[PDB]
Amino acid sequence: MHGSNKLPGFATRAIHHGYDPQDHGGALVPPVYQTATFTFPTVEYGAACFAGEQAGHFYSRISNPTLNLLEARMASLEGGEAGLALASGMGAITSTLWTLLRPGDEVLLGNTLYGCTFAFLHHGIGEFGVKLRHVDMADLQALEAAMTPATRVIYFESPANPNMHMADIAGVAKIARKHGATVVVDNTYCTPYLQRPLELGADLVVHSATKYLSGHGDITAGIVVGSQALVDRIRLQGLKDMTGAVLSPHDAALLMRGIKTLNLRMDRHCANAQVLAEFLARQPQVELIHYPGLASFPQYTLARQQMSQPGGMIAFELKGGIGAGRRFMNALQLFSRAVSLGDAESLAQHPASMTHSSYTPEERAHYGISEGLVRLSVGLEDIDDLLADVQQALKASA
Amino acid sequence: MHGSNKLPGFATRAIHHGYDPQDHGGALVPPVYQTATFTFPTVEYGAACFAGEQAGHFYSRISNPTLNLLEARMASLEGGEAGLALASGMGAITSTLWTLLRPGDEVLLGNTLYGCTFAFLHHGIGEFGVKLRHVDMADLQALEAAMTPATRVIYFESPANPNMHMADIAGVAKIARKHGATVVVDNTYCTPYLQRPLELGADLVVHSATKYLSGHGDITAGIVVGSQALVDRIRLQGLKDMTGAVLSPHDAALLMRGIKTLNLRMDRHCANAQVLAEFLARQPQVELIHYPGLASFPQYTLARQQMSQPGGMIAFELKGGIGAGRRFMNALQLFSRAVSLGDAESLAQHPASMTHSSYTPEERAHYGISEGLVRLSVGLEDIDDLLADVQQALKASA
Amino acid sequence: MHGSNKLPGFATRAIHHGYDPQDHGGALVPPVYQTATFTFPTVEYGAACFAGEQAGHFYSRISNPTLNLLEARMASLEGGEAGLALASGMGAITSTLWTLLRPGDEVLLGNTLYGCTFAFLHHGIGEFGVKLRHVDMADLQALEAAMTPATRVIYFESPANPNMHMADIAGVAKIARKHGATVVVDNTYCTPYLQRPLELGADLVVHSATKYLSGHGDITAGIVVGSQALVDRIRLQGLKDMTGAVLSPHDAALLMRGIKTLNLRMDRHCANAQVLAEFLARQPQVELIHYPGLASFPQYTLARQQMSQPGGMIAFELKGGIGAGRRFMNALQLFSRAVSLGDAESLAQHPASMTHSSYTPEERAHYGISEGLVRLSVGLEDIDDLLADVQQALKASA
C-alpha cells in the first residue's frame, strides 16, 4: 500500500531526512555552521532562547544546527525521538551514564565490555560510589535474579566486544520494565541499518560514530538516540556541564557524508565477512570461529531475529596460541594492524599481543580473551584480495 | 646579553615551536592528521604503544600528531612541561577535576565561576561525594582558614567572570604547597600572552580555546597545560575514560592558525578596550566600571603584577538598572548580542535580560550579578566605530 | 593462479593504491597537506625540485602530496601512466586543450557537448585561431573523411551530454593512430568503474570529479589521466601558466573519500536507473526514452560493449511538450530540480523551461534538445520512493 503517512525507506532518509534545500538558499548540501556563537536581534529573543521557548541557537557546545540535522537524521534511522551528537563514542557513553546515575545507584553491565567502557565504569564512575555488577545478559533468569530496586541502569553491547556474545534485547527490556530500570544499548557494531534496539524496548542507544557510521576512518564522533525527555537531560547535564565532549560541525558534516552510503557499505561489509568467515571455518590453523552468520554460532537463532544481516566483524581463535596470533598479525599485507573497526580498509587485532599484552595469560582468561583470539574488521576491498592475504598469513602463523 | 639559539621570543614560538618542515616533506604548514586510527609495523611495536615506550600513536582519542603539536606549543607559551587538547573549555575542566578528585576530597573555589564550571561543580561532581567551598582568592588569611587535610584542589579564574576579581596566584600557591594541594587556574581571559599562572606557582592551567586563542569564533576547544605527571593523568584518565572530549584535528589546526596572531590580536583587543573603558568612565549613564587598566580599579597593583596588559573585557553597571540594560543592548548596531568572548567581532551581554533573565533580582544578587551589569568583549574593529556605537547606545538607554 | 603479479581488484585500489600508512606515522587515512608552499634543506635540493631532477614539491599550484596520491589513484583506476587534479571539470578540459592546440590546429569535436565545453570552444579558444569541426563520432566513415593534416585533437564525451549519444572509442583511436591525432575523452558519466577509454586507445581522459567520482555533491573538481608526457605537459603549461585551476587539498581529500565507495555507489546508481527506465518505457506519457540499458536504445550493442553497466543517467521525452515538462518538474517532491548529476540525491532538469528557456523552440532543435526532453540523474534513494515520486509527477503532467 503506497500510503500518505508511509516512511520513506532507510536509504532515502539517510540521504534526505530533516533537510529541505529550499530553506537554505537552495543549497543541496547543508552549509556547515562552523561557528561557536550565535547572535540575537534583541534580548527578548535572546532570553527566550535560553528558556527553550524559541528554537533559535545561542552556543555550539549546547546545540548547533549542523549538529541538529545529524542528530535528527540518526534519530530517524534508529526510529527514536531525539539525537545528541558528541566528540566521541566515550563522550556518548560518559555523558549518558554521568547524567543517569548518582551514588547508591546500581548499574548492571554485560559480562564483557569495550575496554574503555570497562575502564570508565571501574576506574571512573564506579569510584564515585556507583555500584557495578556484571551479568550474562543472554541469561534472563540470572538478570532477573540480579535486579535490585537500586538498579537504575542496564548497559550492554550486543554483539559484545570479545567473542560476539548477543543479548536478547526485548527480553532484557521486559525485565527492566518490570523493576523500573533504564536499558542502554551500544549499537556501534550493527548500526541502525542492521539492529534498532529502540524498537525492541531499549530506552537509549549509544554509538561510536567513529566506526561504521562515519565509515572512512577520518573522524572521532559519538551519537546518543532516545526519547526527548532523556536526551534533553543528557544534553543539558552530561554534555553541557559534565564532559564538554562537543563535536565539531566540520566532523558532523563528514559524519552525515558517511551516513549517506551506510546501507551500501554495510551490505558489502556483511557480504565480505560472510565469505571470509566461511573460509576461516575450514582452515586447519583455526580452532574456533565466532561469526553471527555461521550456523555453528551459539546464538544463531537470536542473531537472525534481532539483526537483519550478520555484520562485518569476525573473531576467531588460532590453534597455536599467542605466538600464532603474533605471527598471523605480522604477516598481513592488506589488512592493517590497528585498533578500531568499521572503515573501508580492513583491520585486525590480537589483544594477547597488543591492547592486552602486559597482562598474564590467566588475567586475559578473566576478561573473556583467548591467547589466540584475533578480531577482524572486514572492510570493503575485493574479497579475493582479502582471502589471499588471510590465507598467506594463516601459513605464516605456524 | 644572552644570544646563540637563546630562548626564542613569544611570537616566534607561537608560529614555530615544535615543528621543523624538513620532517614532513618540506611542508611549511604541518599537514592535518585527520585520521581516527593509526597502524603498527608489528604487533610488538603496538604492545609498546599502549605500554608507554616507543610512543607514537594508536588512536586519536588518546593522542594525535596534529594535537600533539598544538599541545607542545601551548606548553611552550604557558611555560609548562606538557599540554593536552580537548573538545571544549568545559572538556578541559571536567577532564581535569574528574581526574584529581574522589569522594571525600574537598575543592576550594573562587567566589564566582563561569556558569557551567559552577554547574559542573554544584550539580555534577559535587553530587558525587566531593565537597565544595567558595573563598575569596585575594584574601590569603581566609584561604588558610578554610584549608583542611582533605583539601586536594584549589580552582579559580583570574580575572573572574562578573567583576574582574584578581587572585594573588603567587599567594595561593604558597599555601597550596604547604598543604599538598593542586592549584588549577582558568587562564582564558588573559591567555599566556598576558599571564602565566605556572610561573607564579600554579600546577595546572586550563582554557576555553574557543575564545581568544582561536580568536575567530569558529571552533569550540580547550587546553590543559602543566606538569607531565599531572597531564599524563588527565589525558589517560579524565579524557580517555571520563569525558571523551576529543578535539577534531581540523579544529586543532584552526586553533594553531589562530595562535599565530595571538600577540597581535591581544595588543589590539587591549588597546581598544583601554580607550572604551576610559570613555565609559566619563559617562553620566555609567555607575561603576570594572576594567583592570583604570587607575581606579581596586586591585590595580595586583593586576599589573600578574598581567602584562589589562585585557580585552569590560564590565560596567548602568544607572537605569535592568531597563537601561535592555535599551542599551537592543540599541547596539556594531557590537553583537551574544554570549562568548575573545572574537574578532565585538560582543556584548547583560545577564539581567539574557543569560540569567529568569532568575529574579535576588538569586542574581547571590552571584555578583548587578541588575544593570553589562559585559563587553572588545573586538578588533576600528576604535572610532566602536566608540560611536557605544556613544549612540548610552543615549538610547535613558 | 596465485602470485603477487596479479592486479588488485578495483575496490582494493580505490581504497589503497599509492598509500602505505607506515610511510606517514601509521595514519590510516593520509594527512592533508593544506599548505601552499614547501621548504628546502639546502638551496641545492631546491635547484633539483624546480628542474624535476629530484622527487620533491615546492608549490601546490604545480604539485602537492595529497593531490599526487589522488592523481596516482585515478591513474590506476583508468589504467593510465599519470594523473592531474584540478579545481573543476572545466579546469581539466581547458588546461588540456589550451596545452595541446595552437592557432592553425583543427580540433574535431563530437556533435553534442556539455554546454560549458561547447562555450569554451566556440566563444573561447575557437576565437583565438583554433579551428572547430563537429562530426558524428559514432560514424567512423564520416570521422575518417573529416581528418585533415591540421587535425591535432579529437574530443568527445561518451555517453554525450544531452541525449546519451555514444562513440566507438576503439574505432576513433584507430583512425587517430592512422593520421596522428590526440584523442581526449570526457569520461565523467561512466567513471573508470564503468568505462576505461585509455584501455580502448584514447590518449587522455578528463573528468568532472564534481559528479560521480566525488559522489556527494560537496566539491568542485576535475581530473586528467593519460601518458606521463602529455599529463606532465598539461601540468606544466595548461595548469601552471594558462588556467591556474588548482585544487584545494581539502577538496582532494574529500574526492579520495568519495572514490572509496565509487563501485558501491555506481552499482546502486545503475540498478536504480535500470528499474526507473523500464518503468518509464511502460508509461503512457513517455513518447521516447533514452537509456543505454534498454534494447530500444539506438546504440544498445555499442553501450553493452564499452560500458560494464548502462549508467545512472536517463533522458526521456514527455508527450505534452514544453508544457508537460514544466508540469512534471514542478510536481517532484523527492527528485530535486537542479543542474549537475552523480549525487546521492536524485536530480532532474528540463532545458526548455530551465537552462535553455532563454532560447527559441527551433534554436533548441539545432542542439538536439526536444521540447519535452527531461533528464534524470538517478541517485541512491530507495527505488520505491523514487518510483512513487515519478509516478505521482507523471499524473500531474496532463
Add this chain to the structure above:
Amino acid sequence: MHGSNKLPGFATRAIHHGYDPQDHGGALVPPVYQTATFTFPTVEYGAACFAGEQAGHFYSRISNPTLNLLEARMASLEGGEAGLALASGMGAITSTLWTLLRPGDEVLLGNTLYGCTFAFLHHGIGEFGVKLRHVDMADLQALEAAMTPATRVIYFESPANPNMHMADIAGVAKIARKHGATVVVDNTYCTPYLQRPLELGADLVVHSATKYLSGHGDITAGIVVGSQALVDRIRLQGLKDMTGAVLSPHDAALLMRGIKTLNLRMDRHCANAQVLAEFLARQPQVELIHYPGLASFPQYTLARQQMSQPGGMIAFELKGGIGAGRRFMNALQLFSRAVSLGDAESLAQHPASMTHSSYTPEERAHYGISEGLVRLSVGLEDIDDLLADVQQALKASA
C-alpha cells in the same frame, strides 16, 4: 565627520562587511556553503536565474554565497564595485586576460613580472596571436610612445617582483584613458590595506590571495576587483569557460578568516621589515638594497604617494655573487628556504641558485636578476630572533 552616509574603517569592514548574522540563524561566523549545486522551488525560478533576473544561485563554479561574501568584502576593501574569487592568483590573472584579449590586440607589460605571469604571457596567451611589449611603467613618455590602437590592456605589478620598481599608477591611467585601454594592476604585495590602485584610476586589480591576504600559508586563492561590467564578464567567460579556476568554499572561508587580521599582520610585517632593512643596509657583505622605506630608495617619493607603508618585502644583493647567496641561504635557521611570501613564517629566496638556477649568468642579468640577489618575505616573528638569524647567515656568506 558624522554624516548619515558614513564609511566604517578598514578593520571594521574586513571583519563585518556584507554579512548580518541575523540573516543566518544568528551565526556569528558565516556558514560554509560547501555545495556544488543549488536547488529551485520551481522550474521557472531557475529559468529566471540562468537569465540573471532574481538573485539566486545555481552552480558553484559560476557563483557561490560564501565566495560572494569574500568577493563583496574584497570589493569594499579595494574600493571597487564588484569582486571575484578564484583558485589561485594565476587563476585570476589568466581569467582576466583571456576575457579582455583576442588575436591582434596588444598588452603592454611592466618590465619585470612574476615568472608565472611572464610564462602565461609569452608561452601561453602570446602564442595565440596576442602581441606583447614590455615597457617601464614609471617612465610616462616611453609609455605614451609605446601605445598603439591595438593596445587594449596595460598590466603590471607595483611594487614589481624584481627590485621593487614602482609604477606611476595615476600617470598610467591618464594615458590609458586617452586610448580607451584597460589598466590592470597586480596588488599582491601591498594588499588593499596598503595601496588601492582603483582609487588611483586603475580599472581592475588582481591578487594572489595565497600570500598576505591568507597570511598563513594554507590556501591557494585569487581575487579580482573592478567594475561590475568587467567582473561579470570575467566571471561568465574567464572563470566559467576558459579556466574553470573555481575556489573551494572551504578555502574561501579560511581566506575570510585571514582577512580579519590583515591590518594587524601587515603592520607587523612592515615594522619587522623596516628593521631588517635598516640593519641590512649597513652591512659590508651587502652591495645594494631595495626597500621602499629606506631614504636611498630611488622611487621613495612615488612609493610613499601610492603606499601607506613600505611593505613586508625586501630585496638585496650580496657582494660575493652566486656563492655568497648560496652560503647565506644554507646558513639560515629561522627563515625558511622557500618560494612564496606573505606567510607568518619568514621566507627567503635566492633566484640565482633556486628558481633561476638552471639559467646562465647572462640570461639572469637579462631579467634584472643579480647573481647575489636575495629576496626576503619578512614574517611576524620577534624581530630579535630574525636579526640574529640574518646576522649569522651574513657571517657564513664569506
